[PDB]
Write an enzyme that holds these catalytic residues in place. Sequence first.
Site, PDB file in Angstrom:
ATOM      1  N   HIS A   2       0.792  -1.230   0.000  1.00  9.96           N
ATOM      2  CA  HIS A   2       0.000   0.000   0.000  1.00  9.96           C
ATOM      3  C   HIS A   2       0.822   1.276   0.000  1.00  9.96           C
ATOM      4  O   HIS A   2       0.234   2.349  -0.175  1.00  9.96           O
ATOM      5  CB  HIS A   2      -0.978   0.067   1.177  1.00  9.96           C
ATOM      6  CG  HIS A   2      -0.332   0.267   2.507  1.00  9.96           C
ATOM      7  ND1 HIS A   2       0.078  -0.784   3.294  1.00  9.96           N
ATOM      8  CD2 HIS A   2      -0.065   1.397   3.212  1.00  9.96           C
ATOM      9  CE1 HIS A   2       0.606  -0.310   4.416  1.00  9.96           C
ATOM     10  NE2 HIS A   2       0.524   1.012   4.391  1.00  9.96           N
ATOM     11  N   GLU A  30       0.019  -7.715   0.948  1.00 13.99           N
ATOM     12  CA  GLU A  30       0.750  -6.497   1.271  1.00 13.99           C
ATOM     13  C   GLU A  30       2.248  -6.626   1.061  1.00 13.99           C
ATOM     14  O   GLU A  30       2.977  -5.681   1.365  1.00 13.99           O
ATOM     15  CB  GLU A  30       0.456  -6.077   2.708  1.00 13.99           C
ATOM     16  CG  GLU A  30      -0.867  -5.294   2.799  1.00 13.99           C
ATOM     17  CD  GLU A  30      -0.844  -3.982   1.987  1.00 13.99           C
ATOM     18  OE1 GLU A  30      -1.699  -3.826   1.060  1.00 13.99           O
ATOM     19  OE2 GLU A  30       0.022  -3.105   2.284  1.00 13.99           O
ATOM     20  N   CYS A  59       5.680   2.426   7.120  1.00 15.72           N
ATOM     21  CA  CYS A  59       5.432   1.153   6.450  1.00 15.72           C
ATOM     22  C   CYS A  59       6.485   0.900   5.382  1.00 15.72           C
ATOM     23  O   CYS A  59       7.017   1.828   4.771  1.00 15.72           O
ATOM     24  CB  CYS A  59       4.027   1.106   5.860  1.00 15.72           C
ATOM     25  SG  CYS A  59       2.750   0.803   7.139  1.00 15.72           S
TER      26      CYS A  59
HETATM   27  C1  LIG Z   1       2.123   2.476   7.372  1.00 10.82           C
HETATM   28  O1  LIG Z   1       1.479   3.014   6.225  1.00 10.82           O
HETATM   29  C2  LIG Z   1       1.105   2.385   8.499  1.00 10.82           C
HETATM   30  C3  LIG Z   1       1.778   2.035   9.838  1.00 10.82           C
HETATM   31  C4  LIG Z   1       0.884   2.009  11.098  1.00 10.82           C
HETATM   32  C5  LIG Z   1      -0.068   3.362  11.308  1.00 10.82           C
HETATM   33  C6  LIG Z   1      -0.184   3.534  12.625  1.00 10.82           C
HETATM   34  N1  LIG Z   1       1.031   2.826  13.265  1.00 10.82           N
HETATM   35  C7  LIG Z   1       1.642   1.903  12.195  1.00 10.82           C
HETATM   36  O2  LIG Z   1       2.586   1.225  12.377  1.00 10.82           O
HETATM   37  N2  LIG Z   1       0.095   1.335   8.239  1.00 10.82           N
HETATM   38  C8  LIG Z   1      -1.301   1.711   8.189  1.00 10.82           C
HETATM   39  O3  LIG Z   1      -1.645   2.850   8.306  1.00 10.82           O
HETATM   40  C9  LIG Z   1      -2.286   0.550   7.944  1.00 10.82           C
HETATM   41  C10 LIG Z   1      -2.546   0.469   6.454  1.00 10.82           C
HETATM   42  C11 LIG Z   1      -3.337  -0.767   6.029  1.00 10.82           C
HETATM   43  C12 LIG Z   1      -3.661  -0.623   4.525  1.00 10.82           C
HETATM   44  C13 LIG Z   1      -4.346  -1.864   3.993  1.00 10.82           C
HETATM   45  C14 LIG Z   1      -3.537  -3.121   4.308  1.00 10.82           C
HETATM   46  C15 LIG Z   1      -3.139  -3.259   5.791  1.00 10.82           C
HETATM   47  C16 LIG Z   1      -2.480  -1.997   6.305  1.00 10.82           C
HETATM   48  N3  LIG Z   1      -3.506   0.733   8.652  1.00 10.82           N
HETATM   49  S1  LIG Z   1      -3.493   0.654  10.353  1.00 10.82           S
HETATM   50  O4  LIG Z   1      -3.781   1.971  10.884  1.00 10.82           O
HETATM   51  O5  LIG Z   1      -2.138   0.358  10.797  1.00 10.82           O
HETATM   52  C17 LIG Z   1      -4.620  -0.635  10.920  1.00 10.82           C
HETATM   53  C18 LIG Z   1      -4.834  -0.471  12.422  1.00 10.82           C
HETATM   54  C19 LIG Z   1      -5.136  -1.825  13.066  1.00 10.82           C
HETATM   55  O6  LIG Z   1      -4.126  -2.721  12.677  1.00 10.82           O
HETATM   56  C20 LIG Z   1      -4.138  -3.953  13.343  1.00 10.82           C
HETATM   57  C21 LIG Z   1      -2.939  -4.581  13.629  1.00 10.82           C
HETATM   58  C22 LIG Z   1      -2.938  -5.801  14.287  1.00 10.82           C
HETATM   59  C23 LIG Z   1      -4.133  -6.394  14.668  1.00 10.82           C
HETATM   60  O7  LIG Z   1      -4.060  -7.630  15.346  1.00 10.82           O
HETATM   61  C24 LIG Z   1      -5.242  -8.304  15.706  1.00 10.82           C
HETATM   62  C25 LIG Z   1      -5.335  -5.753  14.394  1.00 10.82           C
HETATM   63  C26 LIG Z   1      -5.340  -4.531  13.734  1.00 10.82           C
END
Ligand SMILES: *[C@@H](O)[C@H](C[C@@H]1CCNC1=O)NC(=O)[C@H](CC1CCCCC1)NS(=O)(=O)CCCOc1ccc(OC)cc1
Length: 174
Positions: A33, A57, A141
């Site tokens: 992404h 991803e 990321c």
């Molecule tokens: C990098 O672009 C960024 C890093 C992230 C943001 C906040 N802190 C980080 O390390 N990643 C994202 O923003 C990410 C993007 C998606 C896009 C589609 C494919 C997957 C990644 N979104 S997010 O904000 O990180 C999702 C939040 C919840 O993530 C999880 C992680 C683990 C989990 O375990 C049960 C549940 C949800």
Amino acid sequence: HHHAPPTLWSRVTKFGSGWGFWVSPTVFITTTHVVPTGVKEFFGEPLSSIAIHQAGEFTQFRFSKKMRPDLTGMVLEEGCPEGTVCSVLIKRDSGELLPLAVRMGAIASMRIQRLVHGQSGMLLTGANAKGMDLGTIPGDCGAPYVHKRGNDWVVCGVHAAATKSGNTVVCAVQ
Ligand SMILES: *[C@@H](O)[C@H](C[C@@H]1CCNC1=O)NC(=O)[C@H](CC1CCCCC1)NS(=O)(=O)CCCOc1ccc(OC)cc1
């Protein structure tokens, strides 16, 4: 004294809306992404000279030209060793090097928000890794998850996501 050597850090390269990692003079990996879309070239090379493969991803580029001949090839594993400590090699755009210790969990299929073939892990940096100082943040990321197998560093994933607590992180794996 260092945690990771300068050459390993030099493999972490700004790319799209995050980072990627030079596995070898020709192989570059990143998180799907953050990759630019609708473009004709990457790092100056036309698409016709780059083997491109995106699965979930996890994105891999193999360049026909040797792009980082200063580098040796290192091993890309198919995932991180479950239960062991890796390091996430975070570069920040203000210049900091922020290697984050993380103990790796299970590889699983996930749908955060898309179909993620990823591996969860728990940061070992503090009680609750919220914020910029102790955890991962937007813009991080593509950062590689690495560990040392013997005397050699191995790469096994790229940073994809983290919970709002921050303690849990997810890398995309091959
Ligand atoms: C990098 O672009 C960024 C890093 C992230 C943001 C906040 N802190 C980080 O390390 N990643 C994202 O923003 C990410 C993007 C998606 C896009 C589609 C494919 C997957 C990644 N979104 S997010 O904000 O990180 C999702 C939040 C919840 O993530 C999880 C992680 C683990 C989990 O375990 C049960 C549940 C949800």
